[PDB]
A paper describes a structure:
Non-polio enteroviruses (NPEVs) from the family of Picornaviridae are nonenveloped viruses composed of (+) ssRNA genomes that infect humans and cause a variety of human diseases. Herein, we introduce an EMPEM pipeline for rapid structural analysis of pAb responses elicited by enteroviruses using whole viral particles.
Through iterative rounds of focused classification, we reconstructed maps featuring structurally distinct polyclonal antibodies bound to epitopes at near-atomic resolution (structurally distinct polyclonal antibody class—pAbC). We resolved two distinct polyclonal antibodies targeting Site-1 and three against Site-2. Given the polyclonal nature of bound antibodies and the inherent lack of sequence information, the variable Fab domains (Fv) were represented as poly-Alanine models. Specific epitope contacts and angle of approach were highly similar for Site-1 antibodies while Site-2 pAbs displayed greater diversity; consistent with nsEM analysis. Site-2 is particularly interesting because it is in immediate proximity to the receptor binding site (RBS) for CV-A21. While antibodies targeting Site-1 are distal from the RBS and it is unlikely that they would interfere with receptor binding as Fabs, antibodies against Site-2 sterically block ICAM-1 from accessing the RBS and may be able to suppress viral entry. Site-2 pAbs display high similarity in epitope and angle of approach to 1D5 mAb, and a partial overlap with 18A7 mAb that binds directly on top of the 5-fold symmetry axis. Importantly, all pAbs bind in a manner that does not block the accessibility to the symmetry-related neighboring binding site.
Author numbering:
A (entry chain i), E (entry chain e): 16 to 298
B (entry chain k): 1 to 234
C (entry chain l), G (entry chain h), I (entry chain p): 2 to 69
D (entry chain j): 9 to 164, 168 to 272
F (entry chain g): 1 to 48
H (entry chain o): 1 to 239
J (entry chain m): 16 to 75
C-alpha cells in the first residue's frame, strides 16, 4: 500500500539573472521545449497530489463502444426467409468514435470484450401474440463454411463457438483473447497483400492496397432460432466492443475529417475541418 | 443452494462495467509479444509533445497550410501580432492541435501550458518580441502596456531560435472545464513587437514565425467524454 | 487464492495518501482459466515522455543554449 | 566539439555536416538485429553489413516558392540501390533500420523551413471518389523518384489509381500541425542546414516482405515559405541521402521482379 | 468494541446558595446558553445509553430521493419521433424535499448513488401487442456532443458511459465519484460568472447571477432503443439520488417558503410561512 | 457454478438500501480535499 | 481481505454496552475498484458543537458572569 | 440472504462454456478403466504422421487410386514433374491429407512441413531428382534454374528409397491462415529432374513416385473452427 | 478445499515464461459430489508421437541409414 | 507454477559434409521421416515459446 505517482510538484523559486536561461532554446532538433513555470516566473511551492488515471491507455479505452447494428426479421413470408439470417464482417470501422480512438496508435495488443444488446419491434402495421425469441450468435473464423440460410447445417456449431440468448435476460457477453497472426494488430498497412509481377498489367494491385485487403478476422453470423410467426418481428442487434488489457505503440495524429470507407480515403466535400476566425488579432 | 438476494443494478449493461467474463476461445494460445518501439502508456505523453498551432485562420488561409504561419514584418507596428483566448479545449484554433484533440476527449483539465515560438526568417534579421499571458477577468491586453502587466518574456532573436513562454496554472478552481463557460475563461495570450524587427539590405522584409503548444508535466485531465469533433452519417 | 489491493480515493476516503486503514481496500478473485477473462488490469502510471518529447542522441540539458 | 558538427560513417561512405541540429533517434531506440528470443523465420539469416549499410544518395528535388511538399516510401526509394535493392528481391523477408539525412543549404539571406517527418505506416488516400484504397502498385511505389503534395484534392481511372494528397491533411485526413508527434526534425534555413533522423525497424512483426510493405515513409513540408530578397523565385535543392542499418534478410528465391512502368 | 459514545448522563445535584450562578449569562456574546438541568434544578442520576445516530449527516442524507421525472414516447406517428428521447439537465433542483435538505449547508462533498425506476403505459385509447422495451441512459458531460435525434450517431457512446436496461429487470443503478471542480460542491454562489467590464450595459449580470451560471454537470440523455410500433408506449423514468460518504460545511437555516426556480427566488404569493395564533397567552 | 437461491427481497429497490454498486466513471481522480471551517458532523450540533 | 465490525443493537435484549455477544458482528467485503462503490461509511459520533454554540476569542466559564 | 448482482452474460448459453453442472445420475459407478494401446493425447500426434498425398489429381485420376502416383519417365525432360502451393488447407490436393484435415479444423497455423518422397521403380533404375521450396512473394519457379535458387535438396536415387525436404517456416508472420489468402501466401514446392532416370534393357521406363506430407515437431495450430469438407442436408425433426 | 492454478496468457500479460506474478492465478472450487460435474480438466500438453510416427521394434537413429 | 512444454525449438546449425545424412531414409520401414529444418538447411537459433494447447484432445 502506497500513494500512486503524481504529476510534477512545483518547487518554490526566485528571480534569476544567470547566463543559463531555459526560455531560450531551439526546436530545430526534434525535441519539444522543456520549460516549466519555475523557469519563467517566480513560483510558490505547490504540493501536487493529482494524478493521471483517466489518461492511462487502459482507462482511455475502457468503455464498450457500439460497433455495429445488425438486423434480422422473423417472418412467415417466403420472400423474407432470407431476413432471418444476417452475416457481418468483424470490424471496428463501422462506427466512427471508436475508430478515432484506436487510430491514435499504429499498433496495438489487447483482449476484446464483446457484448450484445437486443431490441425488437413489429415493423408491421398490425401485431399480435408471438412467442419469446431466441437468437444465436455464431462466429465463423475465416476458412470455416458459411451457412447458406438461417436454418442450415453450419448452425450446429460443432467447432465454431456460438452463443444462445433468450430475449429479456441479461445482454450476452464473452471475452476474446488477442488473436492477431502478427505480434500486434496493425491499424495501418502501408502496403499490398501481394506483389504484382512483371507479367501483369500496370493497373495491377489496385484493389490489394491497404489494411482493408490484408485483414480477415472472419464473420459473425446471427440468426433467429425460432420458426416463423404470423406477426413479423424486426430485431435490431447492437454489437459492442471494449478493448482491455491494452498496450499501444507509435502514436499518430487523430483524423480531423470524416472517413470514407474502411481506409483513409477522403471525401472531396469534407476536407475543411477548421473554423474561420475574423482576424489573427481576434481573441 | 446458498441464499442470495439480487440488489438493484442486476441484469443491466453498463459500458463502464469491469467484470470478468467467460472466454469464447478457451485455451487459445496468444501470439508471443515482441518489443515494439514507441510504446505509449498514457495519453498525456502525447499531450506533452509540442505541436503546431493553426494561429492564422483568416479568410483565405483557413484549412490551407498557411494557417500555421504567423506574419511578421520590417515595417513598424504597435498592433498585436496575434491574440489568442486561452481555451485549449474550446478555442477555434487550439482545439485541433494535438493538445486540443486529446483534451477534447476530456471534461476537465489542469496544469500549465507551454507556448513555443520559432522564427524562420533570415539569419540577417534581428529584433525582439514580447510574448505575454494575462489571467482573465480584466480588459483584454489590446496594447503593449497591458501586455507588460501580465506575465511575459522577451524573445531576443539571434543564434538560438525557439522561445518558450509558459502560461502558469492560474485558476481559482482546481480544474477548468473543457466547455467554454464564462467561469472557465483561461485568459489572454498575445504577442507584440518589443522593438521593430529590422531587416538589412537585400534581405526579405516579410518574415514568418511558427507557434507550437504543449502540456507542461503538471498537466492532467479528468473524466473521459465523447469528443465533439467527429461525426458520421447515420 | 484472492488478491487485495487499494481502492481509488473517493469523496471521504482519506487524504490522497491511499494509506488510511484497511477500509480503503478491495478484494478480487479470478474465476476463469483464461487470463483474457480477467477484469481490467492494475493501473500503470509509469510513463516516459522523453521517447516522444526529447528523442535526442546528443543528451543536452535544459539550462543550456541548445546550440553551442 | 560543437553540437552543430556531425559526422556519420556507415559501410564505406560518410556524411559530414558542418551545421546540423542534434540527431534524433526515433522513440529513443537505436536499430538492432533480431534476437533469438523473437525470431520468426527458421532459416539462417544473411547480414551483408558493409554492402547494405552504405549511404545512398537519392535524386534531389527543387524547393520553389510554390512547392507544397515531397514524399517517399522508405524501403521503396532504396530499391533502385544496387546492394540492399537486390537483397529485397532475392530474399522474401527482411528488416532494416535507417539513417536518414536531409540537406538543404542557403545563404543567410534566405528564409523558409522544411519539416522532416518520419511516418511509420504512411498510408495514403486514393484519388478516386467512388472507390476506396484504389491505387496501383506502380503509382503507390514510385521508387527513387518521390511524390509531391498538393493544394487541392481533385479525384477522378488513369488518375484514379494514384495517391493524392493534400499537404495540410498529409494525404490521410490529419492536420499537418500534428505531424510533430512523429519523429521529426526541422531544417530551418536560418539556423540549420541539415537534419538527421535514425529509425529502428518498426512493425507488428520482427521481419517482413519489403516488396509488399513500406514500414516508414518520409514527409517533407515547407512549413515556412521559401523566400529570397531579390528574385521572388529562389530555387534551392533538397538532397536526401539514406543508409540502411542493421539489416538482415531471410529466405531465398528466384529474384522477384515487380510489375513496372 | 467501539461502543458508540452516548449523549451526556445527568449528574445528580442538590440546590445551592452559591454565588456561581450559571443561569445568568449573556447572549450578546454570540454564544448559546450553557445551562443544563444539573445547573438549575435538583436532579436525579440518570445513566444515558442513548446516542445520536439518525442525526449523523451520513444518516440524514442516507436515502435516495426522487429527483426528477422524465418521459419518453415510442410512436409510429412522425410528429412523435422527437419524443423518443429526453435530454435532462443534471440537477437536483427539480425536487424540493431534496433541495431543502441539501441547503442546510453552504458547501458539501459527497459521492453519489444514482438509481432509476421505469414505468410504462399505453397513452392511446387502443393497446396491442408490443415487444419488451429497452432503454439507454447515456451521460453527456459538458461540451460533449448532444444527439440530434433518438437514433443519432452520438448514441455510440464510445466514451460517454451508458446503461442498457431491459424493462422489468432490477432497477438499474450506478455510482458516481465526487466530480466537483472545487474541493466541495457549493449550494450557493453569491456572484457572477464573469465581471462585466465597461461593456456598455449597466444591466449586465442580470442574466448570469447566481449558482445557475456556474454549474454545468452535463445532461442525462435517455432514449428508447426500440423502433416504433403500431401501439404507442409511454414511459416515465424516475431518477433517484442518494448522496453518500458526505461531509458538509457552514450550516444555514432551511428555506421556510416555496422555491421559485433554481435560485433563492421567492414568489410574492407565498412569503407568509407562519400560522396565526389567537394570542401570545394561548398555550 | 455455485448453487444459489434467490430469497424474498430480491430484485427490489429500497430507498434506504445500503449495498455496493459498480462505478460509471472508473479510476476517477477525485479533486483532493482542503480544510474548510464550519464542518458539521451531526445535525444535532445545529439543534443545540 | 474482509472487514469485520459490530452491528447496531436490535430488539433482543442487547445490552447497550454493545460488547455483549459475538453474534452482533457483521462482515463487509469491498468488491469494486473505486471506493465510491462502497457502502455507506462507518458511524462517527464525534461532534464539535462549540464551533457553532460557543466559538469565542476569550474562553468563557459557564459559572462565571458572562460579562465582567 | 447474501446481496448479489447479476452481471451481463447472466443466463446465456455459450457452446465454449466451461462450468460445473449437477449430475443427472448421482453416485453413478463408472466402469473402471483399462489400458488400451494407441492412446492419443493431442491432435498433433496425428499431424506428424506421414500421409500419402493425392498429388496427381488430374482428370481421369481424380478420386481413383492413381491420384497418389506421380509419373516418371526415363526420357529426358526439362519440365517440372509436379508443383504444389504450400497452403495446407487451400491446395485441394493437400487439404485432404491428414495434415490438411487436421488443419481444416483450425484457422491459424505455424511450423515447418516435411515432404517425403518414395521411389517405387525397378532396382535397376537410377538417376537424381531435385526437390525444392521457394518462399512467397516471387515468380513461381518455371524451370530448374529457378528451382536451384530456392531451397533445395538433390536426391540421389539408390539403396535408400526415400528422402525428404523440409519447407522451413519462412514467414513474416507468426501464424499463417489455413484459409486461402492472398497475403499469407504459401510459397512454392516443385520437383525437377536433376538428371534423367537411366533404365537398362527390359526394365520399366515408366515408374512412379509416392509423395507423403507431415508436420514437423515445431508445428502448431491455434483456433478451432468448423471444417468445410463436411456437409449435411437440412435437419427437420419428426418427419 | 479450493484449487489454485495458473491461467492461460492474454495480451497485456507477462513474458512467455507464464510464471511471473500472482495476477495469473485463479481459483476453482468443486461444488458437486460426482467428479463428472467438475469443469473441464487441466491441459496436459503431454505427447508421445513415436507411438504413431515411429513404432519400430528395431532402433534407428536419425542420421543412421534406415536400412543396413 | 511453471512454464508449459513448448513445441520444438531450433538449434543453430551449419553445413554438414559428413556421410551420415538424416535426409536420406526409408518409409518401407513403417516409420515416418524424422527430418526437421536443421537437418536439411542452415538454420538460426529460434526460441520457440509456442504451445499445443488448442490441439489437445480436451480442447478439440
Ligand atoms: C462467438 C463470437 C466470437 C467473436 C470473435 C471476434 C473476433 C475479433 C477479431 C479481432 C478484432 C479486429 C482487430 C483489428 O482489426 O485490428
Ligand atoms: C450512465 C449515466 C451516468 C450519469 C451521471 C450524471 C452526473 C452526476 C453528477 C453529480 C451531481 C451534480 C452535483 C450536485 O448535486 O450539486
Amino acid at each position: 500500500v502506497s500513494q500512486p505517482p503524481s504529476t510534477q510538484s512545483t518547487e518554490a523559486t526566485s528571480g534569476v539573472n544567470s547566463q543559463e536561461v531555459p526560455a531560450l532554446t531551439a526546436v530545430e532538433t526534434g525535441a519539444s521545449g522543456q520549460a516549466i513555470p519555475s523557469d519563467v516566473v517566480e513560483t510558490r511551492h505547490v504540493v501536487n497530489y493529482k494524478t493521471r488515471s483517466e489518461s492511462c491507455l487502459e482507462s482511455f479505452f475502457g468503455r464498450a463502444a457500439c460497433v455495429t447494428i445488425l438486423s434480422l426479421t422473423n417472418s412467415s413470408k417466403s420472400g423474407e426467409e432470407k431476413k432471418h439470417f444476417n452475416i457481418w464482417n468483424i470490424t471496428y470501422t463501422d462506427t466512427v468514435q471508436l475508430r478515432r480512438k484506436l487510430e491514435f496508435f499504429t499498433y496495438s495488443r489487447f483482449d476484446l470484450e464483446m457484448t450484445f444488446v437486443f431490441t425488437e419491434n413489429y415493423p408491421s402495421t398490425a401485431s399480435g401474440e408471438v412467442r419469446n425469441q431466441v437468437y444465436q450468435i455464431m462466429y465463423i473464423p475465416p476458412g470455416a463454411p458459411r451457412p447458406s440460410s438461417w436454418d442450415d447445417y453450419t448452425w450446429q456449431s460443432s467447432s465454431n463457438p456460438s452463443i444462445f440468448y433468450m430475449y429479456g435476460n441479461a445482454p450476452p457477453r464473452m471475452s476474446i483473447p488477442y488473436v492477431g497472426i502478427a505480434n500486434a494488430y496493425s491499424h495501418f498497412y502501408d502496403g499490398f497483400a501481394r506483389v504484382p509481377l512483371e507479367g501483369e498489367n500496370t493497373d495491377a494491385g489496385d484493389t490489394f492496397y491497404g489494411l482493408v485487403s490484408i485483414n480477415d478476422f472472419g464473420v459473425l453470423a446471427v440468426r433467429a432460432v425460432n420458426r416463423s410467426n404470423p406477426h413479423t418481428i424486426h430485431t435490431s442487434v447492437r454489437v459492442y466492443m471494449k478493448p482491455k488489457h491494452i498496450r499501444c505503440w507509435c502514436p499518430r495524429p487523430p483524423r480531423a475529417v470524416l472517413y470514407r470507407g474502411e481506409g483513409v480515403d477522403m471525401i472531396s466535400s469534407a476536407i475543411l475541418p477548421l473554423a474561420k476566425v475574423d482576424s489573427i488579432t481576434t481573441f | 443452494g446458498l441464499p442470495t438476494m439480487n440488489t438493484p443494478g442486476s441484469n443491466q449493461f453498463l459500458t463502464s462495467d469491469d467484470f470478468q467474463s467467460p472466454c469464447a476461445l478457451p485455451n487459445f494460445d496468444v501470439t508471443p509479444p515482441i518489443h515494439i518501439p514507441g510504446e505509449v502508456k498514457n495519453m498525456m505523453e502525447l499531450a506533452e509533445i509540442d505541436t503546431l498551432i493553426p494561429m492564422n485562420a483568416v479568410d483565405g488561409k483557413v484549412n490551407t497550410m498557411e494557417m500555421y504561419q504567423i506574419p511578421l514584418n520590417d515595417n513598424l507596428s504597435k498592433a498585436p501580432i496575434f491574440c489568442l483566448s486561452l481555451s485549449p479545449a474550446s478555442d477555434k484554433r487550439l482545439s485541433h492541435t494535438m493538445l486540443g484533440e486529446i483534451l477534447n476527449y476530456y471534461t476537465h483539465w489542469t496544469g500549465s501550458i507551454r507556448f513555443t515560438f520559432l522564427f524562420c526568417g533570415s539569419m540577417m534579421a534581428t529584433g525582439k518580441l514580447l510574448l505575454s499571458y494575462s489571467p482573465p477577468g480584466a480588459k483584454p491586453p489590446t496594447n503593449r502596456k497591458d501586455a507588460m502587466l501580465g506575465t511575459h518574456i522577451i524573445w531576443d532573436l539571434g543564434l538560438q531560435s525557439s522561445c518558450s513562454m509558459v502560461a502558469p496554472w492560474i485558476s481559482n478552481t482546481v480544474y477548468r472545464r473543457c466547455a467554454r463557460d464564462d467561469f472557465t475563461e483561461g485568459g489572454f495570450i498575445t504577442c507584440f513587437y518589443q522593438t521593430r524587427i529590422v531587416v538589412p539590405a537585400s534581405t526579405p522584409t516579410s518574415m514568418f514565425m511558427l507557434g507550437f503548444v504543449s502540456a507542461c508535466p503538471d498537466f492532467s485531465v479528468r473524466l473521459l467524454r465523447d469528443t465533439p469533433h467527429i461525426s458520421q452519417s447515420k | 487464492g484472492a488478491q487485495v489491493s487499494t481502492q481509488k480515493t473517493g469523496a471521504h476516503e482519506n487524504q490522497n495518501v491511499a494509506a488510511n486503514g484497511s477500509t480503503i481496500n478491495y478484494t478480487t478473485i479470478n474465476y476463469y482459466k483464461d487470463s483474457a477473462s480477467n477484469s481490467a488490469t492494475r493501473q500503470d502510471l509509469s510513463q516516459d515522455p522523453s521517447k516522444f518529447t526529447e528523442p535526442v542522441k546528443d543528451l543536452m540539458l535544459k539550462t543550456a543554449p541548445a546550440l553551442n | 566539439y560543437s553540437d552543430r558538427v556531425r559526422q556519420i560513417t556507415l559501410g564505406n561512405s560518410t556524411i559530414t555536416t558542418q551545421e546540423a541540429a542534434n540527431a534524433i533517434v526515433a522513440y529513443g531506440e537505436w536499430p538492432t538485429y533480431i534476437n533469438d528470443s523473437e525470431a520468426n523465420p527458421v532459416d539462417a539469416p544473411t547480414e551483408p553489413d558493409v554492402s547494405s549499410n552504405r549511404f545512398y544518395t537519392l535524386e534531389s528535388v527543387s524547393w520553389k516558392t510554390t512547392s507544397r511538399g515531397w514524399w517517399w516510401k522508405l524501403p521503396d526509394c532504396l530499391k533502385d540501390m544496387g546492394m540492399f535493392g537486390q537483397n529485397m528481391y532475392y530474399h522474401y523477408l527482411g528488416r532494416s533500420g535507417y539513417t536518414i539525412h536531409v540537406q538543404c543549404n542557403a545563404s543567410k539571406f534566405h528564409q523558409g523551413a522544411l519539416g522532416v517527418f518520419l511516418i511509420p505506416e504512411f498510408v495514403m488516400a486514393c484519388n478516386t471518389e467512388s472507390k476506396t484504397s484504389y491505387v496501383s502498385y506502380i503509382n503507390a511505389n514510385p521508387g527513387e523518384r518521390g511524390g509531391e503534395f498538393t493544394n487541392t484534392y481533385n479525384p477522378s481511372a488513369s488518375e484514379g489509381r494514384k495517391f493524392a494528397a493534400l499537404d495540410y491533411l498529409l494525404g490521410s485526413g490529419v492536420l499537418a500541425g500534428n505531424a510533430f508527434v512523429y519523429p521529426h526534425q526541422i531544417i530551418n534555413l536560418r539556423t540549420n542546414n541539415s537534419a538527421t533522423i535514425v529509425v529502428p525497424y518498426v512493425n507488428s512483426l520482427v521481419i517482413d516482405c519489403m516488396a509488399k510493405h513500406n514500414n516508414w515513409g518520409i514527409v517533407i513540408l515547407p512549413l515556412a515559405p521559401l523566400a529570397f530578397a531579390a528574385t521572388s523565385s529562389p530555387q534551392v535543392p533538397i538532397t536526401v541521402t539514406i543508409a540502411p542499418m542493421c539489416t538482415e534478410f531471410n529466405g531465398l528465391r528466384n529474384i522477384t521482379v515487380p510489375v513496372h512502368q
